Amino acid sequence: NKILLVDDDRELTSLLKELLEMEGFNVIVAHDGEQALDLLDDSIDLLLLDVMMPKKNGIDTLKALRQTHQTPVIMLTARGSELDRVLGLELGADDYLPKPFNDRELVARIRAILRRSHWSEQKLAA
Ligand SMILES: [Mg+2]
């Protein structure tokens, strides 16, 4: 499974890339919304997307990517109010996990959405 990490915090993306690779995932990193849209293609199984970023924020990235891709999206951001969470989900995100986050919960939420993608793939092939 291929994950596209989108966050301007280079310290967080390096830490998360290492954590997720250790959990068996293939991770590619984007540091803004424009780079994310450049790297988003059919090979991506899931996006981890931040909100507050320079050039193009996560909400605008989500709106743009949803015009062409149905790729699973988990918002992963310091914008964790109940409002922020509802907004993200309604704009097209599958899940919303505020920062600070628990490593194990992040990995389990990634695995839960990719398990649903696998169920859909099995059904589609049949
Ligand atoms: Mg942030």
Q: What CATH number corresponds to the domain at position 9?
A: 3.40.50.2300
- Structure-determination technique: X-ray
- What is the helix (H) or strand (E) element at residue 26, kind and residue range? strand 26-30
The residue whose two tokens read 């915090």 is: 9
Domain of residue 99, residue span: 1-126
Number of domains in the chain: 1
d(CA 11, CA 91): 27
Neighbours of 12 (CB within 10 A): 14
DSSP 55-84: SS-HHHHHHHHTTT----EEEEES--SHHH
The residue whose two tokens read 């389990």 is: 108
Q: How far is the CA of 55 from the centre of ligand 1 (A)?
A: 13
Q: Give the DSSP letter of residue 54.
A: S
At 69, give phi and psi (nearest 5°).
-125, 140
Q: Cα(first)–Cα(last) distance of the chain, in Å?
A: 21
Neighbours of 5 (CB within 10 A): 24
Q: How far is the CA of 101 from the centre of ligand 1 (A)?
A: 12
d(CA 50, CA 21): 19
Q: How far is the CA of 126 from the centre of ligand 1 (A)?
A: 41
Q: ∠ at Cα 8 (10, 117), nearest 5°?
A: 95
Provide the resolution (angstroms).
5.0
Q: State whether residue 15 is helix, strand or coil.
A: helix
At 43, give phi and psi (nearest 5°).
-75, -15
